[PDB]
């Protein structure tokens, strides 16, 4: 079974799909701090 392993820095976007409105946008380079 395929795997995606998010074990390194990533970007994220939270979208509302009907409007296509981008609610939140960011990057995590280190998930143990703020």
């Amino acid at each position: 079974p395929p795997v995606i392993k998010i074990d390194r820095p990533f970007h994220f976007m939270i979208y509302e799909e009907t409007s296509g409105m981008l609610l939140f946008l960011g990057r995590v380079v280190n998930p143990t701090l703020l």
């Binding site: 995606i4 390194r8 990533f10 409007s19 981008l22 946008l25 990057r27």
Partner: protein, 347 residues
């Protein structure tokens, strides 16, 4: 009537697309001065700048619209843009499964006379709650505003305000609160500390969640990045973009556009797979005064600012400060994210 609905729908699609592009432009600017974790709300920023536009007029207002990538939005009607956020707010408020609420405050200095037409339009479009406030009593003003914002963010932003400029005449504050539940939750039993690579040399150990199920994903051969959809209930989703390679590689922020995002969505495939995704908690705040000037929004921050839709008498007002603060928590059940955006108006 059917044609008005189609047209209002096309206008709303345009607003969303342009707000996404505004967001990517802003991320790029933020990343010039910040090398760590980042988060903010493109939607919240545009909604906040649109709130300000009710107070602004002439070139001051038009430059704001250009800055938001909203130049030649398909119609040229009075109140069109705020009416779009209003319409969008009423529909998003109806999907109860979405878990998205928003609101608006106007904190007004007790001696500062404001045009009723401003109150009327703000209430009409943003359901703004007006709270008179003595800004020459710094600590009282700070406590009252912080209580209000604390309540509406459910304690996720306890102290949006610290320093109070005693020349403040009005502070507009917009908040967005999103509580999403994953469509496929992570079972907390399987969450264990695992290796996360900070760069090519350093690793750290982080709480890593396990998910199994059908998930939509795709690999962009060009950037060498995996893009993964993590859907919530009520037709929202988190897109995660993961570069395989760490090193001298490409700054994704320099190429992030709606065209690119749509290319990824167009090429998604669904299949049973396992997802390992870390828990995280961010809390980021940015003064936007200077970044926004870097996107060409300038006059509103100058002594040429025309905010005469605001004052019952006399516009010698300007925006001294625009601050956003955003918190996000990701865990096995879902995502909770809250954004509070303030614009301070001074004499």
């Amino acid at each position: 009537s059917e044609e008005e609905k189609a047209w209002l729908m096309a206008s709303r699609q345009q607003l969303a697309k342009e707000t996404s592009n505004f967001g990517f432009s802003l991320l790029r600017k933020i990343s010039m001065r910040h090398d760590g974790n980042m988060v903010f709300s493109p939607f919240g920023m545009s909604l906040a700048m649109t709130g300000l536009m009710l107070g602004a007029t002439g070139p001051t207002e038009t430059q704001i619209k250009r800055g938001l990538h909203l130049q030649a939005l398909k119609p040229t009607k009075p109140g069109l843009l705020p009416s779009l956020f209003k319409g969008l707010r009423e529909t998003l408020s109806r999907n109860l499964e979405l878990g998205l609420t928003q609101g608006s405050f106007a904190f007004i200095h007790k001696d500062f006379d404001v045009k009723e037409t401003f109150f009327n339009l703000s209430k009409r479009y943003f359901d703004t709650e007006c709270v008179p406030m003595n800004f020459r009593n710094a600590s009282q003003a700070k406590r009252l505003m912080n209580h209000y914002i604390n309540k509406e963010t459910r304690g996720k932003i306890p102290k949006l305000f610290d320093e109070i400029n005693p020349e403040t005449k009005l502070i507009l504050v917009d908040y967005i609160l999103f509580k999403g539940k994953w469509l496929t939750p992570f079972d907390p039993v399987f969450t264990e500390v695992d290796t996360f690579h900070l760069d090519k040399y350093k690793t750290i150990k982080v709480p890593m969640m396990y998910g199994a199920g059908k998930f939509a994903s795709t690999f962009d051969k060009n950037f060498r990045c995996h893009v993964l959809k993590l859907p919530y209930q009520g037709n929202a989703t988190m897109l995660v973009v993961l570069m395989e390679k760490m090193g001298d590689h490409l700054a994704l922020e320099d190429y992030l556009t709606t065209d690119l995002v749509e290319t990824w969505l167009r090429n998604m495939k669904t299949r049973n797979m396992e997802v390992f995704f870390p828990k995280f908690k961010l809390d980021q705040k940015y003064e936007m005064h200077e970044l926004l000037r870097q996107m060409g929004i300038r006059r509103i921050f100058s002594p040429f600012a025309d905010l005469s839709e605001l004052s019952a008498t006399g516009r010698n007002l300007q925006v001294s400060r625009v601050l956003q603060r955003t918190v996000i928590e990701v865990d096995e059940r879902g995502t909770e994210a809250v954004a509070g955006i303030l614009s301070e108006i001074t004499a």
